[PDB]
Amino acid sequence: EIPEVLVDPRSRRRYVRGRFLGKGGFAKCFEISDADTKEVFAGKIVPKSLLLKPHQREKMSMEISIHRSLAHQHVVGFHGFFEDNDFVFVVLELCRRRSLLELHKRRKALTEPEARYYLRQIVLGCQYLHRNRVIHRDLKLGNLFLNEDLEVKIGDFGLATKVEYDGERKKTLCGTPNYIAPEVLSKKGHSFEVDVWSIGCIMYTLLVGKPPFETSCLKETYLRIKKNEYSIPKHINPVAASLIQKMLQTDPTARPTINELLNDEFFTSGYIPARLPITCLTIPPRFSIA
């Protein structure tokens, strides 16, 4: 039923529906191109048949509200939204090189200078989110998207929440995040630190080549998270291992804040490439001097 050609009344714009990208929760994403300027975008498309209950509607509406007000080099740009009688359409910045998840499935453990590259941009985008009082709450490999230059763009605000006043503890999270912080599981009240915890797990995954708390049962995984039950393999450099630990702590007060992170010895005393080549999508880069 999804129409071949997405029409916005009000802006007059038409978009040809194109290549399927990926799917998740209520949504499906396609490559879409503006029929006029020919400019290309990603279209997030939610069927209204799945948004019959007000609570689901309010989630969709919250996603757009939060995403709508955000512009930054390392967050998937918002270029508009509109609806017809059957679907909601969200027009986003296309990231032609998919996400970190697909990079991770191909390359496993990344070289240390790569992790610094990506981690930095992840932190940068998240620094922007936090100073604008936004909590992502689902940072994971598949939500961190890569444009043609391999620049990271934080995406998917479907679990995001706006902090409303100082010291606010959000007490519910309605969704199931991948790298979910211990204080969400125990329902102890949560805020910005959930994102640092997640960047903890992303750092672990990028360097180690697998998630820190994987088992065959989500609930066993959850048990592990609560009891800080992980371990870093011995080959990981102590400085890296040390940043991972700082971030992966049970007590949210004790983790660095998003602004403390780029100042960490992991970044300041290691090499951080200015840019990565396309080869590095499939070949471990050596970073040779010539």
**Residues designated catalytic:** 138
From the annotation, which residues make up the binding site for ATP? 21-29, 44, 93, 140-143, 156
Verify binding: residue 68, a copy of itself, rule CB under 8 A: no
Nearer to Zn ion, 119 or 135 (CB): 135
For residue 7, the partner it binds in ligand 071, Zn ion, a copy of itself, none, with Cβ less than 5 to 8 A by kind, is none
| Amino acid in position 269 | S
**Own/partner pairs for 178-185, CB < 8 Å, 24+ apart?**
178/138, 178/140, 178/141, 178/142, 179/139, 179/140, 179/211, 180/222, 180/225, 181/225, 181/252, 182/225, 182/226, 182/228, 182/250, 182/252, 183/252, 184/137, 185/222, 185/225, 185/226
Q: Which of 2, 5, 35, 218 forms a contact with a copy of itself (CB under 8 A)?
A: 218
CB of 221 to a copy of itself, least distance (A): 10
Q: Taking contact as CB under 8 A, which single stretch among the options 69-77, 86-94, 145-153, 213-221 is the one that binds a copy of itself? A: 213-221
Nearer to a copy of itself, 86 or 220 (CB): 220
* Alpha-carbon gap, residue 52 to 154, rounded angstroms: 28
Q: Which residue sits closest to ligand 071, CB atoms considered?
A: 22
CB of 218 to a copy of itself, least distance (A): 7
Q: Which residues bind ligand 071 (CB under 6 A)?
A: 21-22, 24, 29, 42, 44, 76, 92, 94-96, 98-99, 101, 142, 145, 155-156
* Binders in 124-183 for Zn ion, by CB under 5 A: 174
CB of 156 to a copy of itself, least distance (A): 19
Nearer to ligand 071, 175 or 189 (CB): 175
Verify binding: residue 71, Zn ion, rule CB under 5 A: no
Nearer to ligand 071, 126 or 261 (CB): 126
CB of 267 to a copy of itself, least distance (A): 36
Verify binding: residue 226, a copy of itself, rule CB under 8 A: yes
* Binders in 186-225 for Zn ion, by CB under 5 A: 217
For residue 99, the partner it binds in Zn ion, a copy of itself, ligand 071, none, with Cβ less than 5 to 8 A by kind, is ligand 071
Phi, psi (deg, nearest 5) at residue 65: -45, -50
Verify binding: residue 52, a copy of itself, rule CB under 8 A: no
CB of 44 to ligand 071, least distance (A): 5
Nearer to a copy of itself, 106 or 187 (CB): 187
Question: How many amino acids of this chain bind Zn ion (CB under 5 A)?
Answer: 2
Per-residue 3-state assignment (H helix, E strand, C coil) for the chain = CCCCEEECCCCCCEEEEEEEEEEECCEEEEEEEECCCCCEEEEEEEEHHHCCCHHHHHHHHHHHHHHHCCCCCCECCEEEEEECCCEEEEEECCCCCCEHHHHHHHHCCCCHHHHHHHHHHHHHHHHHHHHCCEECCCCCHHHEEECCCCCEEECCCCCCEECCCCCCCECCCCCCCCCCCHHHHCCCCECCHHHHHHHHHHHHHHHHCCCCCCCCCHHHHHHHHHCCCCCCCCCCCHHHHHHHHHHCCCCHHHCCCCCCCCCCHHHHCCCCCCCCCHHHHCCCCCCCCC
Question: What residues line the site for a copy of itself (CB under 8 A)?
Answer: 53-55, 171-174, 186-187, 216-220, 222-223, 226
Question: What residues line the site for Zn ion (CB under 5 A)?
Answer: 174, 217
